[PDB]
A and B are shown apart, each in its own frame.
Chain A
Amino acid sequence: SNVSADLIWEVSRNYNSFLVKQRTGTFSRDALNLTNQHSRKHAGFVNDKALGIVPAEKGVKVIAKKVKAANKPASSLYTVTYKSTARKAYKAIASQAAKHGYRADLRQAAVARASAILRSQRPVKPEPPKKLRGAAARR
């Protein structure tokens, strides 16, 4: 037809509302964007098949695009919440990313994002106190 993921990328490769451009790099606020990087590989709103991982109250929540409901935004996302062991979460996310051919190139990024979210959900360690240094600061 007249619309494809390639055309959506050509339209929105230079500007979109998810774009954060700075001197040190270009980032994306898109929810279906693993690694938050502006590229065709990671533009989940552009690609027909795409994955996204967000934190939950405990564990991760993974959304995936449905190809048959692209014109129905309220029912276009397949959502599973994994609140279990991290290994089972990684196995399920890698299974839904690589086993049936649903963006097997995003498998490493999806497992990495799930691991990062689960490590962020851990309690933080208290920082060591600052050591005063020099002449004016110590005295």
Chain B
Amino acid sequence: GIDLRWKHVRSSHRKAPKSDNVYLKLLVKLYRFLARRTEAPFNKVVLRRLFMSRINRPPVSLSRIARNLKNGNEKKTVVVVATVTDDNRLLQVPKMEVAALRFTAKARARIEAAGGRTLTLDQLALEKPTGANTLLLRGPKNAREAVKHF
């Protein structure tokens, strides 16, 4: 026998989505290829967030996107691996180019009316395959009733 005081640890992170969405499966295949064949850390982060669950993907509002568009970020492509929601407290939506998993109808309509562009992640892979000139945004993770009651 061998004396192993320490213990080899199995991985504690997701390697595949639990979702049976076939479009998400195709997106996972695409970003697996991209993260394997490119040196960009952006593709690895995007693939690992595509693995994640819904409580680990909180929504991002247009007010949050407009907040992060300030100070020289007006021309960067906004990348959100989550749902982009509308905020009616924000009366004036600036022009922006956002790629997301999905948009709400009001958020998509308000972006297109303000003159920006909405993209999917495969369109993001086509136009910025290495994630150049991109602003990666996450929503508030701890802003949940369960997390408040923890």
Contact = CB atoms under 8 A, between A and B. Distances in A.
A105 interface: no
Contacts of A11: 22
Interface in A1-52: 6-7, 10-11
Q: Taking each of A6, A7, A10, A11, which has the highest tally of chain B beta carbons within 10 Å of its own beta carbon?
A: A10
Nearest to A4: B26
Given A6-B26, A7-B23, A10-B26, 4 more contacts: A7-B26, A10-B22, A10-B25, A11-B22
Nearest to A9: B22
Nearest to B30: A6
A7 B22 CA distance: 7
A7 B23 CA distance: 8
Please classify the interface of chain B as helix (H, G, I), strand (E, B), loop, or mixed, using the class held by over half of its residues.
helix
Interface in A52-70: none
A11 B22 CA distance: 7
8 contacts: A6-B26, A7-B22, A7-B23, A7-B26, A10-B22, A10-B25, A10-B26, A11-B22
A10 B22 CA distance: 6
Contacts of B23: 7
Contacts of A7: 22-23, 26
Interface in B15-44: 22-23, 25-26
Interface string A68-93: 00000000000000000000000000
B145 to A, nearest CB: 35
A11 B26 CA distance: 11
Contacts of A10: 22, 25-26
Q: What 6 pairs between A and B have smallest CB-CB spacing? A: A10-B22, A10-B25, A6-B26, A7-B22, A11-B22, A10-B26
B91 to A, nearest CB: 35
A6 B23 CA distance: 10
Nearest to B25: A10
A125 B22 CA distance: 51
Contacts of A6: 26
Contacts of B25: 10
Nearest to A11: B22
Contacts of B22: 7, 10-11
A76 to B, nearest CB: 24
A6 B61 CA distance: 33
B67 to A, nearest CB: 34
